[PDB]
């Protein structure tokens, strides 16, 4: 599957969400927009939410394979995550998820 992201390249940020990352880094998506820009976050301290495109990062689960052989866009609708301007529209909320377990550690 894919519950996290990993940057295979570094990109200079100068936007409102300007997030300076490095090549071959780990980052967890948080928001998404234009299915091109994703608001992820590092696993450091007081980090994120950092912005990261889908052309400079890959979706994975740090488990096995890559994107479980799926497209980032195909992995999006999968969870049916809300947009950035939609999700951020108001934190006050809560998303639910269906119970599903796979037969593979």
């Amino acid at each position: 599957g894919s519950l996290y992201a990993i940057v295979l390249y570094d990109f200079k940020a100068e936007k409102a969400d300007e997030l300076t990352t490095y090549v071959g880094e780990n980052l967890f998506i948080c928001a998404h927009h234009n299915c091109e820009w994703f608001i992820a976050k590092p696993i450091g301290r007081l980090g994120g939410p950092g912005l990261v495109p889908v052309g400079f990062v890959s979706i994975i689960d740090i488990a096995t394979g890559y994107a479980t052989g799926n497209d980032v866009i195909e992995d999006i609708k999968s969870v049916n995550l809300p947009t950035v301007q939609e999700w951020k529209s108001n934190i006050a909320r809560y998303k639910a998820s269906n119970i599903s377990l796979g037969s593979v550690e």
């Binding site: 390249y9 990109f11 100068e14 820009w37 495109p53 052309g55 950035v84 301007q85």
Partner: peptide, 24 residues
């Protein structure tokens, strides 16, 4: 002709990452 609501919205379009499959 639409505005933005989010604060984490990007300003510029999609960049150009290396080792890609795009021609210029």
């Amino acid at each position: 002709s639409s505005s933005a609501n989010g604060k984490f919205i990007p300003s510029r379009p999609a960049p150009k990452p290396p080792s890609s499959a795009s021609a210029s």
